[PDB]
Structure formats: structure tokens, C-alpha cells
Amino acid sequence: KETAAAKFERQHMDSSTSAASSSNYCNQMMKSRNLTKDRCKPVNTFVHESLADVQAVCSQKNVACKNGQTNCYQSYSTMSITDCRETGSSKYPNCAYKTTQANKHIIVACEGNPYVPVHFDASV
Template sequence: MVEKEVLIENPWYSSLLLLLVLTLLGLGLVQPSYGQDRMYQRFIRQHVDPQVTGGNDNYCNVMMQRRKMTSYQCKRFNTFIHEDIWNIRSICSTTNIQCKNDEMNCHEGVVKVTDCREIGNSKPPNCRYRARASTRRVVIACEGSPEVPVHFDR
């Protein structure tokens, strides 16, 4: 018990802890704020699948359901990015461009994707999709410090 109290009260220990926190901040390893983190996690759930290089119709049908985009209604269109999250995050460091909502926090990059478009008259949770795999330019909105992707714009 005495050893723990001595360790916490030791100024060297406090300095080391402060240095560690500042180092993590500097390296960008600290998570974004709660709201941005929630939006970042949602972006990953809805748009990131690095394990695949391109999908077919069955891929879209399975992934849209697995990623919970068909529970209450069929999401009409969704894009899965087939890149490592660090490659996607690096898009946030490119030049800012205008988003569809006129904000200036969008960035563009070229990535491998599968676009999933709903086939008319499908019903949740068994929504049906047509897939189109390609390598193309995408635009994502980024926020935070460090900036992380929070919205797939186009």
C-alpha cells in the first residue's frame, strides 16, 4: 500500500505520465471526441471492408444486412471501401474540397470500392442489391484532431 502512494506522489512519475500523454497526442493516437468517435465508428461500420477487393450482388446482400443497414428500411445506396483504415484516414490529409452540403471539410482519394444499389421492391430485412466493383475517386468528410473520416459524401 505504501509503495503505491509513493509512486503516485513521486514528481518523476507524474512527469513521465504527462510526457506519455503528450507523446500520444502528438502521434495522433488519442481518440477523437465522443461525437466524432461515434461518427467515425459509424463510418467504419457502414463503409470499410479491407478484407475484400471487390464484391458481387451476394456480397452486397450479405454485407448490408450484416452491417445493419437493412433492419428497418432498405438503404438505397451504399459504398464499401476495400482499403486499410489507415489508407482511408490518409485521405483526410489531402487538400480540402467542398462537400455536397457546401461545407469545406471534404477530401478526395482513389480507392477500391463496391457500390451496392438496392433493387426495387425488396423488403427489410431481406433487401436485395446490385453490386458494382471498381477503383474510383471518392469524397469523404473528415473532422477532429487528428482528422478522421466521419461521412461518405460521394
């Protein structure tokens, strides 16, 4: 059964420098990562850094999470990311996305032993 850490990897990790894809990065990735299965996940961030650099964020800048938890962490360096956000005409199961590429500081929530990212909180 998928661990919280595994799920963050499937949902958010795409280690590859930058978005690369055949047609439309978000439409393809949101499908392939199973984020269109039971509905159109409305917004999803992919991170294009190594797993090691992302995991490292759990010991970087401690910040409050959007939901009021205190177990979130902001990266010290900007990171390559892509934002996927569902278009207005998107309707499950015909999920369609707008692709926005960015280099920003990521904020992840981290949990467990070992203490690793389980949730993608914000980009700053």
C-alpha cells in the same frame, strides 16, 4: 455508444483488396453491417483499402461536400470500392441490392480531433 468515426468504419470500411463474399456481396454486407435493420439503406459504398489509407484522405485534396460543407477530401489515388444500390423490387425488410465494383477516387467528409472520415460523400 458508437462514435461518428466508428460508424463510418462499420458502414464503409471493408479492408480486403476487393469485394469477397459467399453469395451476393451487397445483400450480405448490407445486412451484416446493420444497414438493413431499421430500413434498407438505399445506397452504400464499401472501401477495400486499409483504414490507414482511408484516414489519410483527410489530409489530401480539400473539396466541397455534396451538401455544401467544406470539410470533404478527395483521395489522390484511385481506391478499390464496391457500390451497393437497392434494386427496384427491394422492399424492407427483404432488402436486395445491386453490386457494382469500381476503382475510383473517394471523397469523404472528415470531422473531429483527431480528424478522421465520418461520412462517405462521392466517388469520382
